[PDB]
């Protein structure tokens, strides 16, 4: 089998700039190297075939270029919607096989989150349950860290992270963090407490709640 | 085990870039030199500095 | 469609084959069907799994 | 305009049987090759099989020989893939995607994917609880509101606001996988402030496995 | 990085 070998594995660029991607063939591949576009949450999109030909609709700032068993993907002007991953593949023989794939993300001005904090439902309390919500909205760079306490003593193990992707309009992230206790866990603490550092603030802010106020 | 190599590549108009590399370290490190050969062609003589044990670099271009 | 001798045999092997279920009978039958040119294979990975859950 | 469409994907036992179909429209299948490629977090992008449907003749990818067929029915312009004994390695999404139209040389057209699940873990719907907006969730003029859509099994879950009339301000959170072998997620939007109470806000929250849809309106606390 | 059903992107760590 021929494999593809895909560098960088992550590449960070601002608006404008012009960036590139490389694909190594472990042996002669000819011309029949592809490269496709995955955008979240969608299929792969054809951008390049025959190594350097553009695919109908494609913009002309995509370009591909081949040297021997070495293939190249360049973004002249990289824009806020080439955000996405890149992969490459060759068809010069059966099985065509694909590269790893380098994910593309956007550099921009550093962004400090709104925090927010969640109780947990009335409704979910019906049922022995009760998640908290820490929501971190539309910061820059992704780096962060949300410590929960609960009545001031610090938690660990019993909270779950989730990111956004990159947002389509100002090249941002979000996050969610959510604290999963017993209903008999939540009914007996009081404060509820978010603590968020980020490059943005100046220093952590601390988001809180006490069980049962409005 | 495998490594990720961190790379600053700083263009000569004063822009930069991040890029990492995994594998293992020797895999990574013959990676990234590949890398900064290919964009020297077009980006001018490249430069690399290694820091943190030769896990993080600043590859320079010249132009 | 009709068969070849061959192709007749190995719908029977799988037919008979005591330790599949019948969703995993059927499935193979059906790839039989879909595939001529990998009656062996589908054959054989059919064996496999009745040898499995012996 | 050219379209492949997967079906059949689901929850499937190790050992069980799936059977995918790929409806093409806007060309026929018998002047291309159809191929079946899965996506998945072990092995990335990887080609399954392929056909050419004027001739029938096929190729496989080592790894399911013998146990996924694909094949073609020219007069309903459809490809399929018959998956026989399955394994958790092929959890995936499986796209189909013709090779060789218009005289392309390269996958021109993907469908939007079937996802497979092999586990042997059972279907279970999704409990959906309101992140009501509150003095806690406003800064700035504009307030966060959302719904937690709680311990479901298999993926996915798809989550629209208003019917899909409210895309803006909303950020919805990849699903985790929870230690008790179910997933999560949230979906929050954030709002005028001085919307709420106004401005009715839902979100629509369907899971197609276990039958599932909810229609949840989101509101402020009562105190 | 590791492909996500959840959105479809690589997540790298
Ligand atoms: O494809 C739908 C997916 O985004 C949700 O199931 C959440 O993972």
């Known amino acids: 089998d021929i494999q593809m070998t895909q560098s960088p594995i992550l590449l960070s660029a601002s608006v404008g700039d012009r960036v590139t991607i490389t694909c190594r063939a472990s042996?002669?591949?000819?011309?029949?190297v592809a490269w496709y576009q995955q955008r979240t949450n969608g299929s792969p999109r054809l951008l390049i075939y025959?190594?350097?030909f553009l695919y109908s609709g494609v913009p002309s700032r995509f370009s591909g270029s081949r040297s021997g068993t070495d293939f190249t993907l360049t973004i002249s002007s990289l824009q806020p919607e080439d955000e996405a991953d890149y992969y490459c593949?060759?068809?010069?023989?059966?099985?065509?096989?694909f590269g790893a794939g380098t994910k593309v993300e956007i550099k921009r001005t550093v962004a400090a989150p709104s925090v927010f904090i969640f109780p947990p439902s009335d409704e979910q309390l019906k049922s022995g349950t009760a998640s908290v919500v820490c929501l971190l909205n539309n910061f820059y760079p992704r780096e962060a860290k949300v410590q929960w306490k609960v009545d001031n003593a610090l938690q660990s193990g019993n909270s779950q992270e989730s990111v956004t992707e990159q947002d389509s309009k100002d090249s941002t992230y979000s996050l969610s963090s959510t604290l999963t206790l017993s209903k008999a866990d939540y009914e007996k603490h009081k404060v509820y407490a978010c603590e968020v550092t980020h490059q943005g603030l100046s220093s952590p802010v601390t988001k809180s709640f006490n069980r049962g106020e409005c | 085990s495998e490594v990720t190599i961190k790379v600053n590549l700083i263009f000569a108009d004063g822009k930069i870039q991040t890029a990492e590399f995994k594998g293992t370290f020797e895999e990574a490190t013959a990676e990234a030199y590949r890398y900064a050969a290919l964009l020297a062609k077009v980006n001018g003589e490249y430069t690399a500095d290694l820091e943190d044990g030769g896990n993080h670099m600043n590859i320079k271009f010249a132009g | 469609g009709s068969y070849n001798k061959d192709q007749q045999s190995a719908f029977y092997e799988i037919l008979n084959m005591p330790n599949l279920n019948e969703a995993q009978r059927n499935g193979f039958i059906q790839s039989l069907k879909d595939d001529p040119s990998q009656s062996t294979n589908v054959l054989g990975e059919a064996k496999k799994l009745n040898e499995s859950q012996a | 305009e050219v379209q492949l469409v997967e079906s059949g994907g689901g929850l499937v036992q190790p050992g069980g049987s799936l059977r995918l179909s790929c409806a093409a429209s806007?060309?026929?299948?018998?002047?291309?090759?159809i191929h079946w490629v899965r996506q998945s977090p072990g092995k990335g992008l990887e080609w399954v099989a392929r056909?050419?449907?004027?001739?029938?003749?096929?190729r496989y990818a080592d790894s399911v020989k013998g146990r996924f067929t694909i094949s073609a029915d020219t007069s309903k312009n459809t490809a399929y893939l018959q998956m026989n004994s399955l394994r958790a390695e092929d959890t995936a999404i499986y796209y189909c995607?013709?090779?060789?139209?218009?005289?392309?040389?390269?996958?021109?057209?993907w469908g939007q994917g079937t996802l497979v699940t092999v586990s042997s873990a059972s279907t279970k719907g999704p409990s959906v609880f309101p992140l009501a907006p509150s003095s806690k969730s406003t800064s700035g003029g504009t307030a966060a509101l959302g719904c937690l859509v709680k311990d479901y099994f298999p993926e996915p879950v798809t989550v629209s606001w208003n019917s899909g009339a409210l895309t803006s301000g909303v950020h919805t959170f990849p699903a985790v996988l929870q230690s008790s072998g179910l997933y999560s997620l949230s979906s929050v939007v954030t709002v005028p402030s001085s919307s709420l109470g106004t401005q009715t806000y839902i979100c629509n929250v369907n899971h197609k496995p276990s039958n599932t849809k909810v229609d949840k309106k989101v509101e402020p606390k009562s105190c | 990085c590791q492909f996500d059903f959840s959105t479809x992107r690589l997540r790298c760590g």
């Open positions: 995607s013709r090779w060789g139209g218009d005289g392309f040389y390269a996958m021109d057209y």
């Open positions: 806007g060309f026929n299948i018998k002047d291309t090759y």
């Open positions: 056909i050419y449907p004027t001739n029938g003749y096929t």
């Open positions: 042996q002669d591949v000819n011309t029949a």
């Open positions: 025959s190594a350097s």
């Open positions: 593949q060759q068809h010069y023989t059966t099985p065509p096989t």
